[PDB]
Homo-oligomer: A and B are copies of this chain.
Amino acid sequence: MFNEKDQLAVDTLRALSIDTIEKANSGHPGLPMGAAPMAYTLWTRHLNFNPQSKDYFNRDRFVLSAGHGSALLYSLLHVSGSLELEELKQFRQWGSKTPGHPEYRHTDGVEVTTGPLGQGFAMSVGLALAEDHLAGKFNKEGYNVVDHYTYVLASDGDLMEGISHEAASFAGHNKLSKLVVLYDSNDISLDGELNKAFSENTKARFEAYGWNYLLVKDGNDLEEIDKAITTAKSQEGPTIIEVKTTIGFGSPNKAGTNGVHGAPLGEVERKLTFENYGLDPEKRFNVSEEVYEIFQNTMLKRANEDESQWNSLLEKYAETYPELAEEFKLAISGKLPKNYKDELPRFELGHNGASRADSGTVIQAISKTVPSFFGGSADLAGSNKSNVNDATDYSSETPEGKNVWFGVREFAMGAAVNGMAAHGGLHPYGATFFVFSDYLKPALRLSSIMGLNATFIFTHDSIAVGEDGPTHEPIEQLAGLRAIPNMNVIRPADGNETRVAWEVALESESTPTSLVLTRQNLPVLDVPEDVVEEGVRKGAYTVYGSEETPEFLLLASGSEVSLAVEAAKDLEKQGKSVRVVSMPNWNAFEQQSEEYKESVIPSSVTKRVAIEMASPLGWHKYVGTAGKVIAIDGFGASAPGDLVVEKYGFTKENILNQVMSLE
């Protein structure tokens, strides 16, 4: 079913990609040269996607995990009627809609921001996860309201990365059938031939994960690829197709070598490659009207008709199942139920609750009030208290279940939460220990680059963890996460603060949120509720004292705020003026006005002291030149948590000694 016109379209894509890279004198020709046939077959024969109707909720989700092949994607998006030839001509240039690695929200049709290898694949696992769960919740007899595939195009670097192993295990265990991977196997990487570091059977590996495997012997044979995709679509497990291609196909002097991977060909080699393709070298950025026409008559019309039929089905779904239809529209919009906050827990004085336990209570409330809430833990739900006890577990037999068992796969869990957030219809969260945030720190960065409403529960935040030792006690993680732009790192001081931090995490549509929680019982603070909501939303607020300019201004976060307050009292009892300020979220505080910033932390107070059970880094911004920081400068210790905390300076008397000794 493939003609010479189809080959003309394929080689047009290749020529376009390399003219783009040639103009920029920057880019990666190899993968776009080698993958153009399978990408063409996918887009024109299967993919239900219109890059113009970029938000069709039942659209197939295609992800290019190999971000360095961005040109190909852009070329595709141009011949499908969403991206101009001028943006291609402005490749890797300032302000362009065609950045070097594909970016979400910047280019229409780019579903997730890719580049860092393996992450696109795991985010695609997350997208398919969201698909299965939403279908399990909403679909009825003859009302397949959620039914679409998840396609990903990956390279050798993707499968050399362990996050691929983690995500593929999770996908095969839960039988995510609508996930299809197209693996460009070119036996070449950046530094040379793949047989220098890689030698393994993708077949046996992925069949051991529970996957289906298909081998395409010639990546240029469009028919073999088409059959592989169709079979993969009719199968019960996740499926990977190892399309065997030659990197830099068409180039005589640079094919099958590392040189074509990430360096421009040059006009000489581009000329010879064009000769091999049967295209005019002298004409640049040329696309035949037949090429545009083919995409118009195949993918675009098919996607339009799928969207139209889905809209009709939904109009009937609203009549037969009205409540579900309203809830589904609210889910797609990402809006939260009105007055959901009104059912969130109120903690009263005399309560001594760990931030993880109070988070668990709030989560019990959120699963009831917000039907889009979805997530789980990395085999630490007993320790993270991230389970909904009134809900079932997600599985192949129970796709509607609202608790996910990610397993000891934290990086993949983060990328999966990111893919779920990119999919839409869900409010996703993932849980682990704060000290193991380091495992998924790349995912977090992508979440902050894309601006995903993903929430990351991190418990066990300090040396108060205790007996589990320095490997399990965080010191430097808060500062690293605070350094990530657009990252809400909220460390609540008590249960009420935890509730408001959850509210921030749910309503933050453009900002990912890490919740840094504790395992030790924290004291509930006598700050009225009004002030807590406002102050957690503004990052830092006064919890004790009325004098804007005092002798002593004590800054604290999380487990320390109560301690700070205690110290304040003693200072007051010896004729010293003092104010105690909680700083749950530094990001929110730096978003506020200079007036509020100087009302909470006047730079006029020279004796400013901060107290945190973490690294000092970043605190001298808020204490000044003549202020002091009481923190942890080394690693932790294996001993009961109270003892470790006391030995590391965080006792009221040592704070008093430090504060009174200062100037």
Residues of A within 8 A of B (CB): 24, 26-27, 67, 92-96, 99-101, 103, 113-118, 156-158, 160-166, 169-170, 172-173, 189-192, 196-205, 207-210, 258, 377, 379-383, 393, 405-409, 411-412, 435-436, 438-439, 441-442, 445-446, 448-449, 466-472, 475-476, 479-486, 603, 615-618, 620-621, 624-626, 633-635, 637-640, 643-644, 647
**Bound-complex Cα distance A94 to B197 (A):** 44
Knowing A26-B467, A199-B172, A200-B209 touch, does A615 contact B162 (C-beta < 8 A)?
Answer: no
Knowing A103-B470, A116-B436, A469-B103 touch, does A407 contact B197 (C-beta < 8 A)?
Answer: yes
Determine which of B113, B190, B196, B207 lies in contact with A204 in the assembled complex, contact meaning CB atoms within 8 Å: B207
Determine which of B200, B393, B647 lies in contact with A196 in the assembled complex, contact meaning CB atoms within 8 Å: B393
- 9 smallest A-B Cβ distances: which pairs? A162-B162, A480-B480, A197-B407, A99-B638, A165-B165, A115-B471, A476-B483, A92-B467, A204-B208
**Bound-complex Cα distance A480 to B113 (A):** 22
**Bound-complex Cα distance A407 to B639 (A):** 40
Least CB distance from A452 to B in Å reads 14
Q: Would you mind naming 21 contact pairs between A and B with Cβ atoms under 8 Å apart?
A: A26-B468, A67-B471, A92-B468, A92-B639, A95-B639, A100-B469, A115-B472, A116-B436, A118-B408, A156-B408, A161-B162, A162-B162, A189-B408, A191-B381, A196-B393, A197-B406, A201-B207, A203-B208, A204-B207, A476-B483, A617-B621
Contacts A191-B380, A624-B625 known; list 13 others, CB within 8 Å: A26-B467, A26-B468, A92-B639, A92-B640, A94-B640, A100-B472, A117-B408, A190-B382, A205-B209, A208-B208, A479-B483, A485-B633, A485-B634
**Bound-complex Cα distance A393 to B94 (A):** 40
The answer to whether B624 and A101 have CB atoms under 8 Å apart is no
**Bound-complex Cα distance A647 to B617 (A):** 28
The answer to whether B379 and A100 have CB atoms under 8 Å apart is no
- Which chain B residues lie closer than 8 Å to A162 at the CB level? 161-166, 409, 411-412
The answer to whether B101 and A471 have CB atoms under 8 Å apart is yes
- Which chain B residues lie closer than 8 Å to A93 at the CB level? 638-640
Least CB distance from A386 to B in Å reads 10
Least CB distance from A557 to B in Å reads 15
The answer to whether B405 and A191 have CB atoms under 8 Å apart is yes
Least CB distance from A375 to B in Å reads 14
Q: Which partner residue on chain B sits nearest A199 by CB separation?
A: B173
The answer to whether A383 and B625 have CB atoms under 8 Å apart is no
**Bound-complex Cα distance A543 to B143 (A):** 72
- Which chain B residues lie closer than 8 Å to A485 at the CB level? 475-476, 615, 633-635
Least CB distance from A22 to B in Å reads 13
**Bound-complex Cα distance A27 to B118 (A):** 35
Knowing A160-B409, A162-B161, A162-B162 touch, does A100 contact B638 (C-beta < 8 A)?
Answer: yes
- Which chain B residues lie closer than 8 Å to A381 at the CB level? 191
Q: Which partner residue on chain B sits nearest A618 by CB separation?
A: B617
Least CB distance from A457 to B in Å reads 14
Least CB distance from A288 to B in Å reads 29
- Which chain B residues lie closer than 8 Å to A203 at the CB level? 208
- Which chain B residues lie closer than 8 Å to A67 at the CB level? 471
Determine which of B170, B377, B471 lies in contact with A191 in the assembled complex, contact meaning CB atoms within 8 Å: B377
Least CB distance from A436 to B in Å reads 7
Determine which of B95, B117, B449, B479 lies in contact with A617 in the assembled complex, contact meaning CB atoms within 8 Å: B479
**Bound-complex Cα distance A284 to B626 (A):** 56
**Bound-complex Cα distance A637 to B448 (A):** 15
Least CB distance from A97 to B in Å reads 10
Least CB distance from A261 to B in Å reads 10
- Which chain B residues lie closer than 8 Å to A113 at the CB level? 471
The answer to whether B441 and A438 have CB atoms under 8 Å apart is yes
**Bound-complex Cα distance A643 to B93 (A):** 9
Least CB distance from A168 to B in Å reads 9
**Bound-complex Cα distance A407 to B486 (A):** 31
**Bound-complex Cα distance A467 to B23 (A):** 13
- Which chain B residues lie closer than 8 Å to A201 at the CB level? 207-208
**Bound-complex Cα distance A463 to B606 (A):** 36
**Bound-complex Cα distance A41 to B407 (A):** 30
Knowing A199-B210, A208-B208, A468-B100 touch, does A189 contact B407 (C-beta < 8 A)?
Answer: yes
Knowing A377-B191, A483-B617 touch, does A472 contact B101 (C-beta < 8 A)?
Answer: yes
- Which chain B residues lie closer than 8 Å to A446 at the CB level? 471
The answer to whether B470 and A449 have CB atoms under 8 Å apart is yes
Q: Which partner residue on chain B sits nearest A444 by CB separation?
A: B438
- Which chain B residues lie closer than 8 Å to A161 at the CB level? 162, 166, 408-409
The answer to whether B24 and A467 have CB atoms under 8 Å apart is yes
**Bound-complex Cα distance A403 to B467 (A):** 41
Knowing A173-B200, A199-B210, A643-B94 touch, does A157 contact B408 (C-beta < 8 A)?
Answer: yes
Least CB distance from A608 to B in Å reads 9
The answer to whether B379 and A191 have CB atoms under 8 Å apart is yes
Least CB distance from A540 to B in Å reads 16
**Bound-complex Cα distance A466 to B26 (A):** 10
The answer to whether B190 and A169 have CB atoms under 8 Å apart is no
**Bound-complex Cα distance A470 to B617 (A):** 24
Q: Which partner residue on chain B sits nearest A259 by CB separation?
A: B382
Knowing A210-B200, A635-B485, A638-B92 touch, does A408 contact B618 (C-beta < 8 A)?
Answer: no
- Which chain B residues lie closer than 8 Å to A647 at the CB level? 94
Q: Which partner residue on chain B sits nearest A162 by CB separation?
A: B162
The answer to whether B638 and A101 have CB atoms under 8 Å apart is yes
Knowing A198-B173, A479-B479 touch, does A160 contact B407 (C-beta < 8 A)?
Answer: yes
- Which chain B residues lie closer than 8 Å to A207 at the CB level? 201, 204
Least CB distance from A625 to B in Å reads 4
- Which chain B residues lie closer than 8 Å to A439 at the CB level? 116, 442
Q: Which partner residue on chain B sits nearest A407 by CB separation?
A: B197
**Bound-complex Cα distance A170 to B161 (A):** 11
Knowing A190-B380, A441-B441, A482-B617 touch, does A635 contact B408 (C-beta < 8 A)?
Answer: no
Least CB distance from A120 to B in Å reads 11
**Bound-complex Cα distance A197 to B209 (A):** 11
